[PDB]
Design a protein around this ligand. Structure first.
Ligand SMILES: CCCCCCCCCCCCCCCCCC(=O)OC[C@H](COP(=O)([O-])OCC(O)COP(=O)([O-])OC[C@@H](COC(=O)CCCCCCCCCCCCCCCCC)OC(=O)CCCCCCCCCCCCCCCCC)OC(=O)CCCCCCCCCCCCCCCCC
Ligand SMILES: CCCCCCCCCCCCCCCCCC(=O)OC[C@H](COP(=O)([O-])OCC(O)COP(=O)([O-])OC[C@@H](COC(=O)CCCCCCCCCCCCCCCCC)OC(=O)CCCCCCCCCCCCCCCCC)OC(=O)CCCCCCCCCCCCCCCCC
Ligand SMILES: CCCCCCCCCCCCCCCCCC(=O)OC[C@H](COP(=O)([O-])OCC(O)COP(=O)([O-])OC[C@@H](COC(=O)CCCCCCCCCCCCCCCCC)OC(=O)CCCCCCCCCCCCCCCCC)OC(=O)CCCCCCCCCCCCCCCCC
Ligand SMILES: CCCCCCCCCCCCCCCCCC(=O)O[C@@H](COC(=O)CCCCCCCCCCCCCCC)COP(=O)(O)OCC[N+](C)(C)C
Ligand SMILES: CCCCCCCCCCCCCCCCCC(=O)O[C@@H](COC(=O)CCCCCCCCCCCCCCC)COP(=O)(O)OCC[N+](C)(C)C
Ligand SMILES: CCCCCCCCCCCCCCCCCCCC(=O)O[C@H](COC(=O)CCCCCCCCCCCCCC)COP(=O)(O)OCCN
Ligand SMILES: CCCCCCCCCCCCCCCCCCCC(=O)O[C@H](COC(=O)CCCCCCCCCCCCCC)COP(=O)(O)OCCN
Ligand SMILES: CCCCCCCCCCCCCCCCCCCC(=O)O[C@H](COC(=O)CCCCCCCCCCCCCC)COP(=O)(O)OCCN
Ligand SMILES: CCCCCCCCCCCCCCCCCCCC(=O)O[C@H](COC(=O)CCCCCCCCCCCCCC)COP(=O)(O)OCCN
Lengths: 111, 147, 82, 80, 205, 155, 438, 187
């Protein structure tokens, strides 16, 4: 019911007319399950079940936007500390409103 | 149980192939397996890459592949000069006071005194002295320690 | 058989909704004629319009885009009734 | 202008011949006469395009000098 | 720099400044200055006056939208069949309601903008965002759940785009010329012009 | 400090002369300069020839600094391994020099956002000294520790 | 340099004249010859020439090509990984598409002109639209995603390049120009934001990798993600440093958010290629942030970590492709007992997964140490944030390994001689770089 | 359709440039750009896609020409003629694919140069709204061009008439591929 397809000698021919099923690469293919396939389809196409609810907005804001806000605040604090550490004047960052034009330290200058 | 013949130093009980490497079946008469089309080209090309990389990493003159190799002797000479100068700085307290005045104008703390001795020949100090940012006393202080 | 997307709604109800697009179709020259005429006169009048702030212009464009009704929408929903 | 215009033109004539053969289903070596003709005309055309570009470059230089752009002798050397 | 040892870019001295030098000897401008009507309309001092000056744009847009829809309805009604109902009684509510609601939205936008700028006392992005937020809130009074969020965001975002690309963008790139020497770099030896190029005359249409 | 356009163009011409002088004789170490081109330009990018030359000089200097720091570390390790339990006393000087070399190498080209490298806790120690002086003279109570004689093996 | 460019132009040229039955052999020989030409370019590149090792121009500013530290590493990496792509791909159509893509990408790396960089890099726009949208195994949605994302980001970059060419008069990197404008800085930045997958512009990469062929995935992960750092070191940092320092808190916000959310999204994956593709996105953020510090450590560490990624992720993608050939499945839940069924494949899979988790004997360790050191030079908290959330990667990698390792399976799915030949160079390069020959 | 969507425009552009017919209003070119892009994206039939592309591009070219950039519009009209020649006289899929790529503005072909001229002229006049709109509308139009590529090679088997009368079609495709590097000086 089966036969060896591969030939190391190089005399390989595919027996498409052979009564016996070749032991080709498809021999070892996984059989698969109907419900697992539908679970895969459901999980990939989870945007179909997306619904805007106040709970969904709450979750998205509190975790994603919350983490962005926390990271931005921490980065701003670190920049302020580094400016105090280095001796630089308060730097004009994009959303900080500063009446100083200091952006890039002059290498030649001693701070 | 135990060992097969009762002796640990007896011939192995398994004759044949433990497994089929790459899944290939040994030929009946001992005929060698025909080599794959890519084997020669693959070995030549990738072995050439690795051999050339080895040769260039080790054969090449210093500073050609690894720039830091070039700097090693120059750093030795600079280390000797810096050693002499820092030793002279520790001995002479009059120079310490002058470098204290130089440091303050450069917004540097006193402990950075060794640092200034180590940045004698650098973009910052060399150009600041020309421009006027660095006090001209630093030139004389450097010279008094044999430059 | 393969996993497939669920189609909301019944087959005949959806087909009935789609069949409401099969209505007498006017020819587009009637709309185009009026748009051409009023557009020519409109371009003549625009050169006399007062200069508006960019912010107001953008808000007016947004309002116009929101208020614009696609020609198909009127097609499906038109009723010859009071 | 460009110092590699003729070589480019010859290669692009080869591009014409081979592409015309491939689009029609023929092999690249088919219709050999088309190759020579394409190469020669493409080389001549690339050259001619280069002189045309240079000539209008020089005309623009003359115009801007008349208008008041103070072009130096080296800048006049930029435009052949 | 293009090396792994020292930082890329460069730095400019803050103490050292470079004297401005004119891009050309004689400057001829083909860009006309703002008209007095533009300054009048842009004036937000009196919020009522500012609102009444800028609403005709919104009313115009609402009238075109209503006319479009009303013509789409009129085109469909059959001339060959006599109609029991009056067509203008059907069509007038369309145009009138579209124009009125557009004018109301534009009025909220302009009034809130002027009121915020007066109270804050400064010209800022925030005035446009707040006026847009209020206008989008009025847009979504009784609308389903995503729309209370999305319309305030869109209507607020619109003035941000208008400010960013209508005011900040032109002012950021006034100095750049494209002819002669680069604005930052005049030390470089480039052909220096007696006069700036005039690619077109001041417009008059 | 103000730069007129005339002076800027004169420096441009002089830099062209420098480039011509360098071009006359071939040099295999052209991109490893031993001296910078001195200038008073607001931005070094204004004169491209000075920019690249001084950038190469800075790179050479930093490579030398790195190798020097490795040297200093080697003698510090040897001195530590030689003395034994007397290391803290006898290796104070060599550690001092090694940490100074580390600070030089790091701080000269730290970058726009990078902070100063505090090898040996010298800047913190100085800050504590200033704080203690001010607190004592002004009668305040300092919530921070007083300055330490030694905080690391050297500095 | 000239030899490398000539060979890069020769590879697509050869396909037109080959017999169409010798195409695979000729393509493999051409790929190895290009690798040798790249080694020659490295040989003729003297470290004494500190700014640029080599610069060549062929009659115009657009034809200006040059190699620097970043360019040389990335070009050697692409020339190293291309032959593996060549052997994995069968058919004249596929060979033609992949050769044209590689020629365009490799010409982009050495280009010194922003407009020529744009022209060469986006020439491979339809080729991926056709490649990812191939008949049976491709998805049109993914091709649309990648094509549209690339088009919008590259058009913004093009607008910034036009403004620079108008103002300065030149857009070549070798001419020193500086700008403080934020619009032009954002125009250049948006390309980097999209090409290096950075949240929320990372959605194109997953769909592309899953529905691209194994050779296509190998090239995409290996060098096309690295094109962002060539653009950053060559065309953004020299001119747009003021804007990166002005926006550094925002840059850190976006980078660290990308790291965290990509790590969390990886946990929700059931497809092996998607797991590797999301690991790539989390890995890109450290590179982008380390370069953005504009320090000597950051640039070197980023290029090193790019090399480490371009040696580790192609191996994982290749192993997954081999397993999919053997099993016709990519779902982790179908695949069990792989340790017993495929000991040789499992060993290399575990080795490369350890490499992706940045264990010491792997190049990812050295690269990560350097990048974290640069972040620590900026601030302590910056490094601490990245170091902690690295544990999320361990969770999903360990869960995947545990799911694959054991169970009951009735299929011997182990790699053949061709497959082992395919990954041997990557394993050797990984070891050699791991012991410190970075 | 091909000859009367390209040839008439050159005379109008010359008349506008030479006789100073320019207006300060940018609404019409902006409306042309946005309407053309959105209608191209929403149009099912292939002829409408190609027709709306011209509306968008001619609106953008009108915005450029009002500001006095005559040279760039005179190059754009010729590059557009060559680019549209192949898609309109569709005989081979590959020629039509190159033509559609050229119309999109895609880098390896001469169409990139022609669009680049117009876009480069835009950044000079420094009108931000126009540039932002240009980017977004260009993306929207690119989706329709991608629809055109999809229809030929990625939807169904395609069989066309064997109308072997490619008088200048092969030359036009050759010119689109080749001409990029000689004309690179323009942009
Ligand atoms: C009595 C005669 C009746 C007419 C009365 C008026 C007569 C004309 C008088 C004067 C005419 C000149 C001025 C009129 C406008 C020019 C248009 C024109 O004439 O073209 C010929 C046109 C017919 O041409 P066609 O080729 O047969 O139709 C092509 C379509 O495919 C048609 O097919 P379709 O309808 O089936 O498909 C429509 C499609 C067609 O697409 C368009 O309409 C393109 C319009 C885009 C904007 C146009 C450029 C705007 C620039 C304005 C410049 C001024 C301000 C400057 C600063 C602004 C900066 C942007 O759009 C849509 O799908 C619906 C959406 C509409 C806007 C889309 C943009 C949405 C953005 C909002 C985002 C918010 C959503 C967030 C939440 C989303 C959740 C995910 O005739 C008209 O439509 C005129 C109707 C007049 C009503 C306009 C109402 C407002 C006008 C001013 C506001 C400007 C915004 C434009 C709104 C839409 C206008 C189309
Ligand atoms: C790049 C940057 C861009 C910047 C700007 C770019 C510039 C833009 C513009 C540039 C445009 C370039 C792209 C377009 C290229 C033009 C298209 C094209 O390639 O041709 C299309 C066109 C398409 O031909 P087709 O596909 O067969 O379709 C036409 C049908 O047959 C329809 O049939 P039909 O009824 O219409 O027949 C009429 C026609 C069409 O008939 C034919 O085409 C049939 C073939 C003609 C006879 C075969 C030609 C014999 C010589 C060919 C040499 C091939 C050598 C390869 C093998 C080596 C053999 C040893 O007959 C003709 O050939 C008229 C020409 C008369 C010459 C005939 C030969 C005279 C005897 C040889 C003279 C000298 C011999 C010296 C040495 C000879 C041995 C090497 O090709 C021709 O018509 C060929 C005309 C010339 C024949 C070749 C003569 C060359 C002279 C011999 C070589 C000596 C060295 C050359 C230098 C010195 C010159 C004297
Ligand atoms: C002097 C001594 C001689 C020494 C030699 C020196 C000569 C110098 C070079 C001369 C060599 C001849 C050139 C080849 C001519 C024919 C090429 C061809 O037909 O393509 C496919 C052809 C093989 O296709 P095929 O199997 O025979 O069937 C084709 C059927 O006709 C239709 O089959 P289908 O219906 O099934 O279509 C399926 C299609 C799937 O559908 C698509 O994907 C269509 C997509 C639209 C085009 C692709 C957009 C992206 C292309 C990027 C360009 C690639 C280079 C990237 C480098 C960056 C450059 C900035 O897939 C393909 O066709 C292949 C995909 C990859 C090829 C795309 C590259 C072709 C670019 C345009 C070709 C030139 C035509 C000129 C026309 C001449 C007059 C008619 O050639 C190849 O084997 C690979 C392409 C080789 C590319 C070299 C062409 C140069 C283009 C680079 C532009 C640089 C400017 C030009 C300067 C050139 C140097 C001066
Ligand atoms: C399918 C695989 C089957 C085959 C298995 C192969 C088995 C491999 C054997 C493991 C090798 C372990 C050797 C580790 C040492 C690394 C070798 C090395 O790097 O060579 C050094 C020379 O050093 C040595 O030879 C080390 C001696 C190895 C033997 C020492 C005792 C062996 C105990 C192993 C402990 C090693 C721990 C090291 C941890 C990093 C090169 O010297 P340099 O010229 O200075 O090169 C520059 C440095 N750098 C590489 C970073 C660029
Ligand atoms: C610097 C150059 C770059 C700038 C570009 C613009 C300048 C253009 C310069 C080169 C122009 C070359 C134009 C090439 C046109 C291609 C030739 C052609 O079309 O021939 C046709 C001509 O078709 C005709 O209709 C013939 C009638 C006219 C014949 C030619 C008339 C010549 C008039 C004299 C022109 C001389 C110039 C006058 C003085 C300047 C034959 O093809 P068909 O038989 O119709 O079908 C082809 C079928 N198939 C290919 C698939 C096999
Ligand atoms: C619609 C979308 C958004 C809706 C939902 C948003 C809800 C989130 C709001 C809370 C977010 C966390 C708190 C951070 C913001 C606090 C308020 C900002 C003001 C601020 O900067 O104060 C600083 C907060 O401390 C700080 O520097 C930050 C401390 C908190 C960060 C650490 C806590 C989480 C750690 C997890 C890792 C994340 C960070 C990784 C680096 C301390 O004031 P100051 O002395 O700096 O002076 C600065 C002058 N205002
Ligand atoms: C006997 C045969 C033995 C076979 C197995 C051994 C294989 C070779 C082992 C020794 C060769 C090591 C070379 C590997 C790459 C080292 C690169 C390198 O460190 O030098 C860099 C050269 O610059 C450059 O630009 C280099 C460009 C090319 C780098 C390789 C790019 C990756 C290619 C794919 C990975 C394969 C690697 C093998 C500059 O070094 P530095 O300035 O940073 O200072 C060094 C301090 N760190
Ligand atoms: C294409 C940009 C469109 C923005 C997209 C954001 C997401 C859309 C969501 C809609 C939300 C409405 C839009 C708000 C965006 C503004 C950012 C808020 C920051 C902020 O509030 O500060 C203002 C300035 O920022 C500003 O208002 C100017 C900042 C410019 C916005 C950011 C530009 C880059 C964003 C691109 C992200 C990627 C593009 C993909 C969309 C206040 O400033 P103030 O002067 O009033 O001081 C106050 C004195 N009263
Ligand atoms: C809301 C968070 C921000 C999201 C961005 C996250 C991090 C991106 C940073 C990229 C780094 C370089 C980019 C330069 C700046 C981009 C955005 C920085 C934040 C920002 O919007 O600052 C604004 C200034 O920038 C501007 O005025 C222009 C903003 C960018 C324009 C958006 C689209 C431009 C497309 C142009 C295409 C190419 C055109 C070339 C001619 C307003 O801040 P402010 O200083 O006014 O302070 C007022 C506060 N009270």
């Amino acid at each position: 019911s089966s036969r060896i397809a591969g030939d190391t000698t190089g005399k390989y021919t595919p027996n498409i007319f052979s009564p016996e099923t070749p032991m080709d690469r498809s021999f070892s293919h996984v059989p698969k399950n109907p419900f697992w396939e539908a679970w895969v389809f459901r999980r990939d196409n989870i945007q179909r079940e997306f619904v805007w609810t106040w709970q969904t907005i709450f979750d998205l804001a509190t975790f994603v936007g919350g983490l962005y806000v926390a990271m931005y605040a921490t980065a701003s604090f670190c920049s302020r500390q580094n400016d105090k550490r280095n001796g630089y004047p308060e730097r004009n960052y994009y959303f900080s409103d500063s009446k100083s034009n200091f952006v890039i330290p002059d290498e030649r200058e001693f701070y | 149980s135990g060992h097969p013949n009762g002796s640990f130093w007896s011939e192995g009980t398994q004759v044949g192939l433990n497994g089929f490497k790459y899944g290939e079946i040994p030929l009946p008469n001992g005929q060698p397996r025909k080599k794959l089309w890519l084997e020669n080209i693959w070995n030549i090309g990738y072995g050439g890459f690795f051999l050339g990389a080895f040769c260039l990493y080790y054969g090449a003159p210093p500073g050609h592949v690894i720039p830091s190799q070039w700097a090693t002797p120059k750093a030795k000479d600079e280390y000797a000069v810096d050693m002499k100068m820092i030793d002279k700085y520790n001995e002479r307290p009059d120079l310490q006071a002058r470098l204290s005045i130089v440091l303050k104008d450069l917004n540097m703390i006193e402990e950075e005194a060794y640092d200034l001795i180590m940045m004698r020949k650098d973009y910052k100090v060399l150009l600041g002295l020309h421009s006027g940012r660095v006090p001209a006393d630093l030139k004389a202080i450097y010279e008094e320690l044999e430059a | 058989d393969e996993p497939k997307h669920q189609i909301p709604g019944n087959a005949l109800d959806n087909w009935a909704f789609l069949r409401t697009y099969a209505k007498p179709l006017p020819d587009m020259i009637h709309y185009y004629y009026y748009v051409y005429l009023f557009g020519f006169f409109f371009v003549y009048k625009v050169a006399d319009f007062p200069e508006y702030s960019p912010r107001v212009l953008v808000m007016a464009a947004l309002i116009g885009s929101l208020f614009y009704v696609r020609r198909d929408w009127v097609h499906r929903e038109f009723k010859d009734s009071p | 202008g460009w110092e590699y215009a003729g070589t480019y033109g010859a290669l692009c004539g080869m591009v014409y011949a081979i592409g015309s053969n491939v689009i029609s289903g023929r092999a690249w070596f088919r219709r050999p006469w088309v190759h020579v003709t394409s190469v020669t005309l493409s080389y001549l055309g690339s050259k001619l395009l280069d002189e045309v570009q240079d000539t209008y470059y020089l005309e623009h230089l003359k115009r801007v000098e008349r208008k008041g752009l103070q072009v130096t002798e080296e800048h006049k050397k930029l435009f052949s | 720099t293009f090396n792994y040892v020292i930082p890329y870019g460069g730095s400019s001295s803050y103490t050292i400044n470079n004297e401005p030098v004119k891009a050309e000897e004689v400057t001829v401008d083909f860009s006309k200055e703002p008209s007095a009507s533009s300054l009048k309309l842009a004036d937000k001092s009196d919020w009522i006056a500012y609102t009444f000056n800028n609403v005709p744009l919104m009313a115009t847009v609402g009238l075109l939208a209503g006319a479009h829809e009303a013509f789409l309805h009129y085109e469909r009604t059959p001339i060959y069949g006599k109609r029991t109902y009056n067509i203008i009684k059907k069509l007038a509510p369309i145009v009138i309601n579209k124009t009125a609601y557009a004018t109301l939205l534009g009025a909220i936008f302009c009034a809130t903008d002027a009121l915020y700028e007066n109270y804050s006392g400064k010209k800022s992005y925030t005035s446009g965002m707040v006026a847009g937020a209020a206008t989008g809130a009025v847009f979504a009074i009784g609308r389903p759940l995503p729309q209370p969020l999305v319309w305030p965001l869109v209507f607020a975002a619109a003035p941000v785009i208008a400010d960013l690309f209508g005011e900040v963008y032109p002012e950021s790139m006034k100095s750049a010329r494209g002819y002669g020497t680069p604005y930052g770099f005049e030390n470089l030896d480039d052909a220096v012009p007696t006069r700036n190029p005039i690619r077109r005359n001041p417009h008059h249409y | 400090t103000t730069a007129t356009i005339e002076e800027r163009r004169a420096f441009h011409k002089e830099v062209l002369d420098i480039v011509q002088s360098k071009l006359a004789n071939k040099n295999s170490e052209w991109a490893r300069p031993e001296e910078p081109i001195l200038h008073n330009l607001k931005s070094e990018k204004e004169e491209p020839h000075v920019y690249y030359h001084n950038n190469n000089f800075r790179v050479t200097r930093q490579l030398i600094h790195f190798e020097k720091t490795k040297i200093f570390e080697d003698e510090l390790d040897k001195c530590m391994r030689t003395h034994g339990e007397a290391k803290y006393r006898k290796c104070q000087e060599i550690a001092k020099r090694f940490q100074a070399s580390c600070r030089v190498a790091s701080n000269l080209e730290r970058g726009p956002n990078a902070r100063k490298r505090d090898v040996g806790f010298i800047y913190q120690n100085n800050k504590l000294r200033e704080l203690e002086k001010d607190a004592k003279e002004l009668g305040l109570n300092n919530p921070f520790p007083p300055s330490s004689p030694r905080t690391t093996i050297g500095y | 340099m000239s030899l490398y460019l000539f060979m890069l132009f020769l590879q697509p040229l050869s396909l037109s004249f080959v017999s169409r039955s010798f195409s695979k052999i000729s393509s493999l020989m051409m790929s190895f010859a290009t690798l040798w030409s790249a080694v020659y370019m490295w040989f003729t590149s003297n470290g004494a020439n500190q700014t640029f090792y080599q610069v060549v121009s062929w009659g115009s500013d657009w034809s200006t090509f040059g190699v620097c530290y970043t360019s040389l590493y990335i070009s050697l990496l692409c020339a190293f990984i291309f032959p593996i792509c060549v052997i994995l791909v069968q058919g004249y159509r596929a060979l033609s598409i992949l050769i044209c893509i590689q020629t365009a990408v490799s010409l982009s790396i050495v280009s010194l002109h922003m407009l020529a960089f744009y022209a060469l890099f986006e020439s491979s726009l339809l080729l991926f639209f056709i490649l990812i949208g191939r008949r049976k195994y491709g998805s049109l949605s993914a091709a649309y995603n990648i094509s549209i994302y690339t088009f919008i980001s590259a058009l913004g970059f093009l607008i910034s390049a036009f403004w620079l060419n108008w103002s300065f008069g030149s857009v070549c990197a070798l001419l020193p120009n500086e700008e403080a404008n934020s619009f032009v800085a954002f125009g250049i930045f948006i390309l980097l934001w999209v090409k290096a997958p950075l949240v929320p512009f990372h959605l194109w990469l997953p769909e592309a990798h899953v529905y691209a062929p194994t050779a296509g995935s190998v090239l995409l992960a290996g060098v096309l993600l690295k094109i962002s750092i060539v653009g950053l070191h060559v065309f953004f940092l020299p001119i747009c440093a003021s804007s990166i320092v002005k926006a550094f808190p925002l840059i850190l916000s976006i980078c660290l958010g990308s790291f965290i959310f990509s790590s969390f999204s990886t946990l929700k994956q059931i497809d092996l290629k998607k797991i590797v593709a999301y690991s790539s996105i989390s890995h890109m953020a450290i590179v982008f942030l380390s370069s953005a510090t504009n320090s000597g450590l950051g640039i070197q560490g980023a290029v090193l970590y790019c090399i480490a990624h371009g040696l580790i992720s192609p191996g994982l993608f290749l192993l997954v492709g081999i397993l999919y050939k053997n099993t016709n499945t990519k779902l982790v839940f179908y695949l069990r007992g792989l340790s017993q069924q495929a000991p040789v494949w499992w060993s290399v899979w575990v080795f490369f997964m350890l490499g992706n988790l940045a264990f010491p004997l792997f190049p990812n360790f050295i690269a990560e140490v350097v990048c974290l050191s640069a972040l620590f030079k900026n601030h302590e908290l910056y490094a601490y944030a990245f170091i902690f959330f690295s544990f999320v990667g361990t969770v999903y990698s360990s869960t995947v390994l545990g799911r694959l390792k054991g169970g009951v399976s009735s299929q011997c799915v182990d790699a053949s001689r061709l497959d082992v030949i395919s990954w041997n160079p990557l394993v050797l390069a990984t070891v050699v770089t791991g012991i410190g020959y970075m | 359709a091909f000859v009367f969507s390209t040839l008439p425009k050159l005379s109008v552009l010359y008349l506008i440039s030479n006789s100073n017919i320019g207006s300060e209003c940018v609404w019409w070119g902006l409306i042309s750009l946005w309407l053309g892009s959105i209608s191209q994206y929403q149009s099912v039939f292939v002829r409408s896609i190609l027709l709306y592309s011209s509306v968008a591009e001619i609106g953008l070219v009108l915005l450029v020409l009002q500001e006095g950039f005559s040279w760039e519009a005179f190059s754009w009209v010729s590059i557009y003629f060559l680019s549209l020649s192949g898609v309109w006289h569709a005989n081979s899929k590959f020629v039509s694919a190159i033509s559609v790529a050229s119309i999109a503005g895609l880098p390896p072909f001469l169409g990139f140069i022609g669009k680049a001229q117009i876009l480069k002229s835009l950044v000079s006049i420094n009108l931000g709204i126009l540039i932002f709109s240009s980017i977004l509308a260009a993306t929207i139009s690119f989706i329709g061009y991608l629809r055109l590529i999809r229809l030929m090679y990625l939807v169904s088997p395609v069989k066309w008439k064997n109308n072997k009368d490619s008088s200048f079609i092969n030359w036009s495709t050759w010119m689109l591929t080749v001409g990029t590097l000689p004309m690179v000086y323009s942009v």
